[PDB]
Each structure stands twice: as structure tokens, then as C-alpha cells.
Paper text:
Here, we carried out a structural and functional characterization of the TOSV cap-snatching endonuclease, an N terminal domain of the viral polymerase (L protein) that provides capped 3′OH primers for transcription. We report TOSV endonuclease crystal structures in the apo form, in complex with a di-ketoacid inhibitor (DPBA) and in an intermediate state of inhibitor release, showing details on substrate binding and active site dynamics. The structure has significant rearrangements in the domain folding compared to previously reported EN structures. To better illustrate these changes, we show the structure in comparison with the EN domain of the homologous LACV, the prototype of the Orthobunyavirus genus, in Figure 2B and C. The TOSV EN fold is organised as two alpha-beta lobes rather than the one alpha/beta and one alpha bundle lobe architecture that is conserved in LACV EN and all previously described bunyaviral cap-snatching EN structures. The active site of the TOSV EN is defined by the H-D-PD-E-K motif, and maintains the canonical configuration observed in other His+ cap-snatching ENs.
SeMet derivatised DPBA co-crystals grew as thick plates that diffracted to 2 Å resolution and were thus used to solve the TOSV EN structure by single anomalous diffraction (SAD). The structure of the TOSV EN with DPBA shows the inhibitor binding through chelation of two Mn2+ in the active site of each molecule in the asu. The anomalous signal from the two metal ions is detected for both sites with similar intensities. The Mn2+ ion occupancies in the structure are of 1 and 0.72 for positions Mn1 and Mn2 respectively. Mn2 is octahedrally coordinated by the central D113 and two water molecules, in addition to D90 in the flexible loop, which swings into the active site and becomes ordered relative to the apo structure. When 0.5 mM of DPBA inhibitor was added, we detected a further increase in thermal stability of 10°C that was dependent on the presence of Mn2+ (Tm = 49.6 ± 0.2°C). Since DPBA forms no direct contacts to the protein, the increase in protein stability measured upon DPBA binding seems to be a result of the second manganese ion (Mn2) binding to the active site, induced by the inhibitor. Upon DPBA binding the number of bound sulphate ions is also reduced relative to the apo structure, thus suggesting a lower affinity for sulphate ions. Only SO4− is present in molB and no density is observed for SO42+ and SO43+ sulphate ions in molA and molB.
Numbering used by the authors: 2 to 205
Write the structure that this text describes.
Amino acid sequence: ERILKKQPAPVRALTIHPLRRYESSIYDTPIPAYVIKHSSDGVTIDIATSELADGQSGSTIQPFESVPAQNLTLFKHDFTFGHLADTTDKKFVEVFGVLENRADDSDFQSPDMIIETETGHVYVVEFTTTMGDANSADLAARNKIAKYEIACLDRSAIKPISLYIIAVHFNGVVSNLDLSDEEVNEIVFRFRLARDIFEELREI
Ligand SMILES: O=C(O)C(=O)CC(=O)c1ccccc1
Ligand SMILES: [Mn+2]
Ligand SMILES: [Mn+2]
């Protein structure tokens, strides 16, 4: 029995912390070689993690990164943020039930994460990437906010919601999380490697 579930009710509202621009500081860091291995189910990326220095950026990458067939088209997105979410996409209805007397499209939207805490707070997290610059990253983040703001606001009448975004570009991150330099660098480092592996997968 969990006592933190027995607290008075929090304010039921939508909270959005402001977006901030972060710059990567990956200053000439080893990037691991890779070989794309044919598998029964999708591919497995054989990545030479032994080439990396202990604790350098990229230390969250696994020696063998499985990419099942069903996750292939979102590889760039999912490899980039794979150290933060095992998987992505959870439907609103799975956490809130149907909002109104009748279901509608907002019940079946699925941001990359919907996290419910014992204290009764819900965190909605959306990841996105861009091949553009920091200005393109800020625009992609604002587009994800606009995509989910209505569903979050309506469901905030049930449990309070905080909506977080991470948008990655080649040289940094736009996010309303409060990220360290090392956390920014991990996201960017994985995105940069993901871009490389993608140029190969698309040719194959
Ligand atoms: O674009 C993103 O940032 C997504 O997180 C997309 C996503 O979930 C998805 C799922 C199924 C089909 C197309 C996109
Ligand atoms: Mn998604
Ligand atoms: Mn996403």
C-alpha cells in the first residue's frame, strides 16, 4: 500500500515550462564504427562500443542495437531517444479512459511518453528531430506542442499534466526540460550517429 496516493488533490491544470535552446559541446569525440547486420526480424546494428572512452558521449549506446522490422521507419527518432524511453507512443485513453460520453480522435492520440506518478501527476513527453538548424528545432518543438496541447488541456481536468518536448538538431536541443551539458550531448551524439545509419538503411 502506497501512502503517497493518499494526498489531497493537486490543482487540475496544464503546465508547460518554457522552451530553452541548448548547444552541444561534443568537441572532437570518437564516433563508433558500425555494421548493419541482417536479422530474422529487422536488423541489428553492430556498433563498436569498445572504440569509445569510458563515460564519453555515446556511452548509452549498446554493442548491438536491435531494430525490429516494425520500428524501422522510426529508427532515427527512436534510436536518438532510446536511452530515455524503451519504446514510445502511449494512447491517452490508456491512462485517462475516454474523456467525454463518446470517444473521439483525441483519445487515440499517442505522444511518445505518458508517465503517471503516485502523487497523481501525469507527464506527457514528445520527442522530435529535424535536419535543419536550431530555428528549425524550435519550430518542430512548437509544432509538437500545438499537436497535443488540446488533448492535454482537456485531460488536465482529470489529473494535472505537464507537457515536455525535446527537439534535436545536429548542433543541439530545444527543450523545456532542464538538461545538463552531458544530457544534451548524449541526445545529439545519438542523433548524429542515427543520421549516418539512416543514410545507409534508406539506400538498402
Ligand atoms: O514524429 C514523431 O515525432 C513521432 O513520435 C511519430 C510517431 O509516433 C508515429 C507513429 C506512427 C506513425 C507515424 C508516426
Ligand atoms: Mn511517437
Ligand atoms: Mn516523437
